[PDB]
C-alpha cells in the first residue's frame, strides 16, 4: 500500500534527524579540539624553526596531503605497493562487494572509466554468487531449525561468534587494533558500508590478504541469507 | 607580554661593522622566537634575520647572507647582531622583534609580529670621514 | 545446484584476477610517479632547512595527516552541522559510506555500529515500498518482447537518474565530464569511495543530493528486482527444457 | 671532496677556528655541517648550515659558544667555537649530504661526503 510507503519514509527521515543529532553531540566537540590542535601544532613548528616560512610549511603540508590522496603515505622512507598482483585483486573484490573502502581509488583517467564498467557488470555477477551461497545456507538452516523466531535468534547469535567475534580476534592480534576498532572494522565491512578508516593489510603474511576476502565472501553470504530467510517470512506475514 | 630594549645604533664607516643588541625584559615564560628587522628611508620594512628562543637555529635574509650573524645570550635573554662589511644600502632604523606565535617569519616586513623594539638609527657614511 | 555455485565462484575469481591485472596496468605506473615525488619533496625540504630533523618532519607530517583523517584541513587558518550530520546518517543507512568524514570518537564508533545494524534493514523496507510503486508504473518473440521493454526502462533511467544529475554536478561542483559520471555510478552502486562527495554554494544542494540518491537507488534496484523476477521464471522454463 | 684546516692545541677558554672547503663540482646544492668524534664516545653533531647559508643549526652541547659561518663565493664553511671546555677534545670532521640525510641522526651515519678530520685538543 502507498500509505505504508509514506509512513516508512517519515520513519526513515526522523531516524536520520535522530541519528544526526547523536552523531553531532559525540563528534563535533572532538572536531573542534582537532581543529585547535593542528593550528597550535603549526604555530609551534614555525616558532621553533625560524628557518621555515609559514608559506614554506603550507607548501610541504600540501605535498603531504597530495600524496595521501594518491595513495602513497608521506610518513616513511619506503615511499609496499597497493597495485601488486594480490592487492589489485583485493581492490577488484572491494568494488564487486559494493564495499569501496576509499583508502586507494582509481586516480587515472582510464582507471576511472574501467572502474565504471567493472562495477556495472561485476556487481550483478557477485549477486548471482551470493544467491547460490544463500540457497545452500538456507537448506542447512532449514535442517538446523528442524533439529520460528526462537530458532532465528540461535542462528544469528552463532553467526556473530564465527563471522564477527572470531575474525575480530585475528584483526586485533595481527593489525594491533583496539577491541572496539576490531569489531567496528568487521561491522563496517560486512555491512558493505566501507568507510576506509580501517583496512586489512594497512602499513607494516602472504595468506593474510586472500583470507580477508574469503571472510568477506562467506561472512557476507551468511548474514544476507539470514536476512532474506526473515524477509521471506515477512512477505508472507 | 614581553618588552624589548635595544643598544647599538649610530654612525659607522663604509666597510666597517655594526654591533646591535636587544634584551627581552618581559617575563613571558612560554618561549619566543626573536629577530631583527630594518626600515629603510624610502623602502618598506625588511627582515634581517631570525633566531629561535633556545638559540639552536638562526635565519639570515638574502640581502645580508654572508655578512650578518645573529647571536643569543640565553642566560640574559638577549639577541645580538654583528653586520660586517657595511654598505650605504644598510642605512636604516633597526628594530628587534619577538613573536612567540610563529608569525615572525609570516612576511618579509613582519606585519604580524607581536612584540616590537624601540628601533635604533643606523647611518653608513662613505668618503665623508 | 552446488555445481553452479562452484562454477559461479570460479567465474567471480577469474573476473577479479582479470580486473586486478587491468587496474594494476593503469594505476601502478602513476602510483610509482607519486611515490617518487613525495620522497623527493621531503628530501629537498630537509636539505634546504638544516634546522628540521627528519624525525621532526615526520612528526609534523603525522600531525597534518591526523588532522586530515579527522576532517579538519591542515591547509589554511563544520562537517557535523544539523544538515551535514543528517547527510552522514543517510550515507551510513544507504551502505554508501564515503569515508571523507568518519566517527573518530570512541562513542561515535559504538553508536555507528548499532546505527548501521538497525538502520540498514529500515532503509530496505523503504526501498521495498518505493520498488512496489515503481513496479506498477513499469508494468504500465514472447521472451524477447519482455526483454525489449526492459532495455527501454533501463536506457530511460540512465538519462533521468544518471545523465541529468551528472550535468548538474559538472556545472555546480566544476568536475570533469568523466568525474561527474564516475561520482554518479560509484554513488548509485553504494560503493562510496569518497574521492568525490557532493557539497565540498547553496543550502538546498545537500538535501537535493540525498533525494537523488533515494529516488535513483530505489529505481535501479526495482528494475534489477523486476528483471530478476522474470529471469527466475525464465530459469524455470530453461531448467524444464535443459 | 672536503678539505679541512684549523685543528690543533688550544688552551682552556680559548677559541677554535676551523675551515672546510668543498672542492667537489656538485652543482646540485648540498647542506654542510660539522661533527666531532670523541676518543671514548660516538660521533656527535656540532652544527649544520644550508647550501646558501641562509639558515644554520647548533647542537645543545655547543649552541651558546659555536658559530657556523659560510663563504658561498669560495664554497667554504667555518667553525668558531669560543670559551672551550676540556670536553671539546675530539677529531672534528666536516660533512656534506645533499640528500637531506645530514640531520638524520646525531652521529651522521647517513652522510654522503665526509672530510679528512682535524685533531683538536683543549688543555
Ligand atoms: K554497499
Ligand atoms: K559502500
Ligand atoms: K565506502
Numbering used by the authors:
A (entry chain B): 73 to 151, 154 to 221, 237 to 293, 298 to 330
B (entry chain C): 1 to 129
C (entry chain A): 73 to 149, 155 to 217, 232 to 291, 297 to 338
D (entry chain D): 3 to 125
What does the publication say?
To examine this, we chose the functionally inactive nanobody CA10758 which interacts with the most exposed tip of the Cap domain. This nanobody is hereafter referred to as Nb-Binder-58 (or Nb58). None of the four chosen nanobodies interact with or near this loop. Instead, Nb-Binder-58 binds as a dimer to the very tip of the Cap domain where it interacts with several residues that are unique between TREK-2 and the closely related TREK-1 channel. A Crystal structure of Nb-binder-58 (Nb58) in complex with TREK-2. This functionally inactive tight binder interacts as a dimer with the tip of the Cap domain only. D120 and V122 are unique in TREK-2 compared to other TREK channels. Interestingly, the functionally inactive binder only interacted with the extracellular tip of the Cap domain whilst the modulatory nanobodies interact with both the Cap and extracellular loops much closer to the selectivity filter where the primary gate is located. To determine whether this nanobody can detect TREK-2 expression at the cell surface, Nb-Binder-58 was fused to the mVenus fluorescent protein and applied to HEK-293 cells expressing TREK-2 tagged with the mCherry fluorescent protein. Figure 2B shows overlapping signals that are not observed on cells expressing TREK-1, nor for any other K2P channel. A similar, functionally inactive nanobody (CA10757: Nb-Binder-57 or Nb57) that exhibits almost complete sequence identity with Nb-Binder-58 is also capable of similar immunodetection of TREK-2. This indicates that both these nanobodies represent useful tools for the specific immunodetection of homomeric TREK-2 channels.
